[PDB]
Amino acid sequence: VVQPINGDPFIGSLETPVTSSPLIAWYLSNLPGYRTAVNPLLRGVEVGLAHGFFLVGPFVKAGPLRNTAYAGSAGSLAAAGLVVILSMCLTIYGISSFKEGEPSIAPSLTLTGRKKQPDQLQTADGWAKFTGGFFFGGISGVTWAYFLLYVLDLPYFVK
Amino acid sequence: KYGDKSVYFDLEDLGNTTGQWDVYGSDAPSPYNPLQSKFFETFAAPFTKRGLLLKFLILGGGSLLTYVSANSTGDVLPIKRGPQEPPKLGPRGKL
Amino acid sequence: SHSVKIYDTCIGCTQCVRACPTDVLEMIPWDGCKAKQIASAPRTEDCVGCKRCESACPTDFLSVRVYLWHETTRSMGLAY
Amino acid sequence: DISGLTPCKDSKQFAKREKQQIKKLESSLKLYAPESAPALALNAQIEKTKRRFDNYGKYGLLCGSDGLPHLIVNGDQRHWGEFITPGILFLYIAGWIGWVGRSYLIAISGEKKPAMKEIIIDVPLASRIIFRGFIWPVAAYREFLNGDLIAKDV
Amino acid sequence: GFTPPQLDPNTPSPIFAGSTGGLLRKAQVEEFYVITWNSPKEQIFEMPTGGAAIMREGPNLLKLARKEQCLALGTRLRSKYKITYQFYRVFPNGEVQYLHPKDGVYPEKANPGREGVGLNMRSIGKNVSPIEVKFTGKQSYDL
Amino acid sequence: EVKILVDRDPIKTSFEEWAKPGHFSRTIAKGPDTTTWIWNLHADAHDFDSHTSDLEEISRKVFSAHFGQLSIIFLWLSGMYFHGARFSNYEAWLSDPTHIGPSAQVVWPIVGQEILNGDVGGGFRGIQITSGFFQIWRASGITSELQLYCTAIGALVFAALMLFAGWFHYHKAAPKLAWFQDVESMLNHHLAGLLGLGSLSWAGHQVHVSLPINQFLNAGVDPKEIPLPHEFILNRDLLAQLYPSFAEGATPFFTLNWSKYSEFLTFRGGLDPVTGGLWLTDIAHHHLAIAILFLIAGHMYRTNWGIGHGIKDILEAHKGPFTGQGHKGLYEILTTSWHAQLSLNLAMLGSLTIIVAHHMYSMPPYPYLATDYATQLSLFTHHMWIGGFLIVGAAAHAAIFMVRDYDPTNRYNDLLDRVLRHRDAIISHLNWVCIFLGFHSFGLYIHNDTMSALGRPQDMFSDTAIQLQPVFAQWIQNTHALAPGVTAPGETASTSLTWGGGELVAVGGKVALLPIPLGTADFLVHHIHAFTIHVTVLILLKGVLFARSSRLIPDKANLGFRFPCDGPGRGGTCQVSAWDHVFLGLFWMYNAISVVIFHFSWKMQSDVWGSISDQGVVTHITGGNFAQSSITINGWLRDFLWAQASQVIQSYGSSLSAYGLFFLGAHFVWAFSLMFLFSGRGYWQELIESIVWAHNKLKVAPATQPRALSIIQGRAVGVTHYLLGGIATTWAFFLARIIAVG
Amino acid sequence: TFNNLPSIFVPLVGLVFPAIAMASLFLHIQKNK
Ligand code: CLA
Ligand code: CLA
Ligand code: CLA
Ligand code: CLA
Ligand SMILES: CC1=C(/C=C/C(C)=C/C=C/C(C)=C\C=C\C=C(C)\C=C\C=C(C)\C=C\C2=C(C)CCCC2(C)C)C(C)(C)CCC1
Ligand SMILES: CC1=C(C/C=C(\C)CCC[C@H](C)CCC[C@H](C)CCCC(C)C)C(=O)c2ccccc2C1=O
Ligand code: SF4
Ligand code: SF4
Ligand code: SF4
């Protein structure tokens, strides 16, 4: 089912099973990157929580102090630092890409041709709310990963 | 008209022509619980001013970095432990 | 963008513009040669700078001449 | 005895180089019979080395502290065999090459398509010219005086 | 005021199974250079975005990426298939600028009705040195 | 259907066209206005697709050119067999092959180069060759120098025959296009008739000549005492005294009682422990089975009779669901284009050369090959390089197809179109995985280097600090070591002894391929190899796909396959041509194969090769310093490059002195190449015009106008000098290193 | 404290001054008036 995007052959993409399928499109459409209708703050919270855990993963066990007793604590600290930096670069991104009050640069159309509402994430205040959610969610996910490594160390692998 | 037989240049609907599509941007409503959403709103609205967020991030991160590197001892980083070893005399005496 | 210039040594052979892939050039009438035509460069905004025009100018050095200048999205030849 | 260099006919390290190379070639000589081709070739190389060292001794070459002949180029009459006589021997041949080539290019210059004579070398023409560079130091001097060596701009 | 633009209508596009060399976000915020041509038969041609397309019998329409794409296509059309072509420029606001002949005639036939610009009435060596135009916007070649 | 369509006297045998150079092309057959003309005379010399437009003359030209190549190879083999016959110690090398250096070249004593004739052994002064011809000849049961001279004369005869064949098949009776296009018969013959009957005839030699002779050579018999090979053909009692199955003749064969043939057609896999090579008994059975297989495979394609698969009927039968029409059209773009076939055959022949390199060290097929570490190393390295070059040429000729012979109107294909339509996806994911592999294969070396430099060896990716063990390769290794058994009975041992459960084949003092242990360093370097291969495929596939069009140049095909650029516009569009892509892929193939042969040399010298005393303690050439030093780049610089280049540079005044000479020289030629790759034509044309003023001042203005090299020519000169220099550096380094410590 | 000043200034300089500098310079790049 490799017919082009929206059946439009002169747009540079295709509706292959990987892009446009009932399972993978649904998955890419019901996650906080593409929830264009809900406010960007909850989206950013979800995103930051997930990436905070994903970053605390390869800092405790993989790192300069992984074998020491300071593995979990200092690794979570480095993960929170990387999260602060990611919110930092997200912030300069929101400042540089769109200024203060312009309308959303997101597409106001869908595959079915409906003149949907534009994604307010791409606005200034919207991206700022998204960055705030990302920072809050990321620090929270870092400390929760630290908590789970603390109180529930035995089921997880140490190696 | 964009939906005609192999017509992709609706000059009125330039979004469908140029490819402006939310390819996966579902406009479905908030699937979160309202109470936790309000909780996150009230607890992350401080991080709403991107400029204040950036100033806070840079200054607090630099402060925490200096604090960690100044209060950490040599047990967590060997550079502050010091030599804890006698110095070797270099070639030709020491020169 | 680029500054294409046609000097008065042109013989009006129409190779500069038949080689130009971006419609920058066009032949106009003139009274300075046996062919009674000379090339002009109105659409310099569409000039990418490929110098196919001056790789086909059969003169002492050149008559058409491309000067590299402020590069925009269309002079840089970007589809994005 | 100039430049702090002892001659090779009265040098110690030069004879030491000789002895060392001869012992090296003799160590590779006790692996074959003394009448077979390898041993005969090794003995020939040995005599070649010994005569080489003795010839460098008898020519008055100057061997330094490292024991190798250091050639003198300054212009000392004793050491014109180092640079100046072979230098003239070179320049005579090199100007032969240049002069026969130049007279060839001038010979084909009055052709309809001269470049095909640089690809397909006219061997009769060159062979009639190939010995005309024997006298290059005088023909070139006259072409310089007559004005035929250097071209004029027009 | 002798040749009017053509104002391409909603014509059909060639049969093509879709590629990746098509229209990216440049079209969504800048021009994208529609081309229109008129085929005698349903034949097959190489697309400038890579791949083979099947042009339709009658008028066609292709929105590819940029000027060089449509002009390369049109040159291949005119030389290989002997077919009249004309292409445009479609800004995202809506305007459609006509560009390829701008006189109904291709830019090789010196047809009167076009003003000569980019025209220095001198040999190319008689341009002034840069010091003669130092600290001036005119670089070397606009006097 | 198929026929012998061939036309007589198409072209006249005459020197008239020799006298007119550049006759083949229109712009070249009018004269050298410039010097570039001569570079275009050689560049387009074999570009027959550009000389003519019809495929008939091109097919005849390349057919006779292949005949010239075969004449050249027959003359080359004539030289090798002759030099073995006259200028060699092969008659002495058979006596003590584990200690006599195989030598087949002697130099002339003129200018001191007679030092190159060294103590190879055998009462002979020459150059220690690393070709393995001596090992073949021991595997062919030569046992003489007369046989080698006769082989050289016969090879010279076949060279002259092939030369006459090219002349006959171009000038006297040249085949027309219907003859080449009958690929069905060509495959039926080359499978069954060249590869089938060739392997069958070699099995006959292996059974009648190599096996009985090596049964004596390995059994302490001097070559002068061995009966001649034909005495086994004339007298079957002597042949039967070792293999009694010959007393029954072909009655075991035709009655299908093959169980009474295992004396000489074996399946006892592994290496002959008396000489280190594979069992010739197994190789005879091998080539026999391969003969059966290619003989049944060459009766697959319909030629004239009702049986056989028409290849069109095979390709058109395969039509994918969302893959479109599928393989329809390919028979018409492969049979109406030599460049497509050239690309396909080059790619497969190159990967096959590499597989040869890989299977010739781990299953040494010749006697006294594994112990001739120089031959083993040189052969692996050689065939690896040939394979990389053939793959890179496959890219070049795929690109040439896409520019010239590709026609979606007449000679249409569906799958090629589908590949062109998402070419950006292909190149994007390849450009990603190259970066991923680059990072996670070389940044690991950088991490190990930094951790070792910061005094943190507990943080490297080593076999001691952080385990990156090749678990999958270790599993395949351990199951191929324990393969003799339930999965592969009747083999008596593993098919190779490069696996952990294998054993050591002690041949003389040498070790000859004990197991190879795979550690973290092997993981790192194998991912480096995957990385370099993936980048080479990125560059080359990108050139092939974008040979016709890109977002930058949509009319690139009209510019040609081999063009420099399309001007400084578009920010600069240098090297958009597929020629320039393959010119870059050459460098990346060089980096790839260089690190490959470095991995080979070091892993072998550290974990495989060495010397095993009679007590059983094997000491390797380096000392097992691969898994500890090949985790960081400083080990390759220190323990491989710096250390193992202590026998090529210390070889001044030795027999290995030409190796150090070419070490420095290939260094030089590489660096000299950098003058071409870095510079541009315009500077050199301006300099040439200045010295042309200096010449015109003296009436020495050449009519063939001195022009700086064309841009594409500067790139060609740069890449060829770069490759030649790096490759000759590596060749000298390897050969001197491995001949000295041996 | 003099032995503790590198521990304050090196993490300050080599990480924050890149943060401040690269951020402010990316903002200066991506600007419009
Ligand atoms: C010796 C007798 C002879 C003569 C007089 C001719 C004469 C001719 N041949 Mg024929 N030909 C011959 C033998 C001969 N051929 C043989 C033996 C073959 C088989 C290889 C061919 C195959 C052949 C083909 C395929 C073609 C010709 C063509 C031609 C014509 C032009 C050839 C030319 O100018 O290039 C002269 C070229 C050379 C003198 C050198 C060529 C290279 C030789 C074959 C091998 C080089 C080996 C060398 C050692 C390798 C380099 C390494 C080195 C650096 C160490 C001309 C009518 C062409 C023609 O008519 O097309 C219009 C053409 O396409 N010939
Ligand atoms: C530049 C080209 C080149 C050169 C100079 C060499 C040089 C050498 N090769 Mg290599 N080789 C090359 C290309 C080259 N090879 C390529 C492209 C292949 C892939 C087919 C091979 C495969 C190969 C093998 C398998 C062997 C060599 C061997 C040798 C050495 C002995 C020469 C010989 O003829 O012995 C006699 C030749 C043989 C014993 C080879 C047997 C024939 C092979 C297996 C197949 C037959 C070819 C077939 C008809 C065509 C391909 C069919 C197609 C389906 C792929 C010598 C170092 C031999 C060696 O190292 O011995 C110590 C050896 O065993 N080479
Ligand atoms: C089966 C093997 C095979 C065959 C039949 C061909 C045949 C052809 N190739 Mg392909 N090619 C091959 C292998 C092959 N090549 C390989 C292995 C590579 C990788 C490098 C290439 C890369 C390649 C490119 C990139 C191009 C070709 C081109 C060509 C065509 C013209 C070549 C020509 O006229 O040069 C005649 C011969 C020469 C000019 C001499 C080359 C000089 C070499 C480099 C000398 C140095 C190498 C030497 C071993 C080192 C010793 C130095 C010593 C002398 C001092 C011709 C159709 C060209 C083409 O089609 O143009 C449109 C083209 O552009 N090929
Ligand atoms: C050592 C020299 C060198 C290096 C490092 C590279 C690096 C690269 N080349 Mg180049 N290239 C080189 C020489 C080199 N090339 C030469 C001499 C040629 C001449 C032919 C080419 C031709 C060439 C082509 C034609 C192509 C490449 C490609 C690539 C990329 C593949 C690896 C990658 O991205 O993975 C990750 C990066 C590396 C492995 C590089 C080392 C970086 C280390 C691991 C970490 C760096 C530090 C880290 C980011 C911290 C930053 C600190 C901060 C202070 C800045 C990468 C950009 C290919 C490409 O772009 O597609 C992938 C490609 O198509 N190169
Ligand atoms: C003595 C000596 C020395 C020194 C010397 C000197 C210093 C010299 C100089 C010289 C000089 C200062 C010179 C100059 C010259 C100039 C010129 C100007 C010339 C010209 C020429 C010509 C022109 C020629 C030509 C020709 C010829 C004749 C040859 C061939 C041909 C031709 C044509 C090329 C020393 C001590 C070191 C050493 C010893 C020796
Ligand atoms: C050096 C160089 C040149 C100039 C190289 C020249 C033209 C080669 C020098 C002349 C050759 C050696 C021919 C002269 C030899 C002839 C056969 C004449 C014979 C004379 C006697 C030696 C017999 C380029 O044109 C170039 C172009 C693009 C990128 C880089 C470069 C580049 O680096
Ligand atoms: S190519 Fe040069 S000479 Fe010819 S028409 Fe154009 S400007 Fe005139
Ligand atoms: S540089 Fe290229 S685009 Fe510009 S006028 Fe010349 S040919 Fe046309
Ligand atoms: S630098 Fe050379 S290759 Fe690049 S655009 Fe200019 S002329 Fe072409």
Swiss-Prot record, chain A:
Membrane spanning residue stretches: 75-95, 132-152
Membrane disposition: Multi-pass membrane protein
Highest taxon above the source species: Eukaryota
GO molecular function, one term: mRNA binding
Subcellular location: Plastid, Chloroplast membrane
Annotated GO CC locations: chloroplast; chloroplast envelope; chloroplast membrane; chloroplast thylakoid; chloroplast thylakoid membrane; cytosol; photosystem I reaction center; plastoglobule
Protein name per UniProt: Photosystem I reaction center subunit XI, chloroplastic
Species name: Arabidopsis thaliana (Mouse-ear cress)
Swiss-Prot record, chain B:
Region entry Disordered, spans: 76-95
GO biological process: photosynthesis
Membrane topology recorded in Swiss-Prot or TrEMBL: Single-pass membrane protein
TM stretches of this protein: 52-68
Chief place where the protein resides: plastid
Keywords, comma-separated and alphabetical: Chloroplast, Membrane, Photosynthesis, Photosystem I, Plastid, Thylakoid, Transit peptide, Transmembrane, Transmembrane helix
GO annotation, cellular component aspect: chloroplast; chloroplast thylakoid; chloroplast thylakoid membrane; nucleus; photosystem I reaction center; thylakoid
Location relative to the cell: Plastid, Chloroplast thylakoid membrane
Family: Belongs to the psaH family.
Function text: Possible role could be the docking of the LHC I antenna complex to the core complex.
UniProt-recorded name of the protein: Photosystem I reaction center subunit VI-2, chloroplastic
Organism: Arabidopsis thaliana (Mouse-ear cress)
Gene: PSAH2
Included stretch of the parent chain: 51 to 145 of 145
Curated annotation (Swiss-Prot), chain C:
Binding site for [4Fe-4S] cluster 2: 20, 47, 50, 53
Protein location: Plastid, Chloroplast thylakoid membrane
Keywords associated with the record: 4Fe-4S, Chloroplast, Electron transport, Iron, Iron-sulfur, Membrane, Metal-binding, Oxidoreductase, Photosynthesis, Photosystem I, Plastid, Repeat, Thylakoid, Transport
Gene Ontology CC terms: chloroplast; chloroplast stromal thylakoid; chloroplast thylakoid; chloroplast thylakoid membrane; photosystem I; plastid
GO MF entries: 4 iron, 4 sulfur cluster binding; electron transfer activity; metal ion binding; mRNA binding; oxidoreductase activity
EC primary class: oxidoreductase
Reactions mediated catalytically: reduced [plastocyanin] + hnu + oxidized [2Fe-2S]-[ferredoxin] = oxidized [plastocyanin] + reduced [2Fe-2S]-[ferredoxin]
Free-text remark on how the cofactor is bound: Binds 2 [4Fe-4S] clusters. Cluster 2 is most probably the spectroscopically characterized electron acceptor FA and cluster 1 is most probably FB.
Pfam family, one: Fer4_21
Entry membrane topology: Peripheral membrane protein
EC number: 1.97.1.12
Membrane-crossing residue ranges in chain numbering: none
Cofactor(s) annotated in UniProt: [4Fe-4S] cluster
4Fe-4S ferredoxin-type domain mapped to chain residues: 1-30, 38-67
Annotated GO biological process: photosynthesis; photosynthetic electron transport in photosystem I
Gene3D superfamilies: 3.30.70.20
Residues at which [4Fe-4S] cluster 1 binds: 10, 13, 16, 57
Quaternary state and interactors: The eukaryotic PSI reaction center is composed of at least 11 subunits.
Protein name: Photosystem I iron-sulfur center
Species, as recorded: Arabidopsis thaliana (Mouse-ear cress)
Gene: psaC
Swiss-Prot record, chain E:
GO cellular component, one term: chloroplast thylakoid
Record keywords, A-Z: Chloroplast, Membrane, Phosphoprotein, Photosynthesis, Photosystem I, Plastid, Thylakoid, Transit peptide
GO MF annotation terms: mRNA binding; protein domain specific binding
TM annotation in the entry: none
Ranges where the record places region Ferredoxin and ferredoxin-oxidoreductase binding: 76-84
Subcellular localization: Plastid, Chloroplast thylakoid membrane
Membrane topology, as annotated: Peripheral membrane protein
An example Gene Ontology biological process: photosynthesis
Subunit details: Interacts with CURT1C.
Role this protein plays: PSAD can form complexes with ferredoxin and ferredoxin-oxidoreductase in photosystem I (PS I) reaction center. PSAD may encode the ferredoxin-docking protein.
Family, as annotated: Belongs to the PsaD family.
Designated name of the protein: Photosystem I reaction center subunit II-2, chloroplastic
Taxon lineage: Eukaryota, Viridiplantae, Streptophyta, Embryophyta, Tracheophyta
Gene: PSAD2
Full-sequence range covered: 62 to 204 of 204
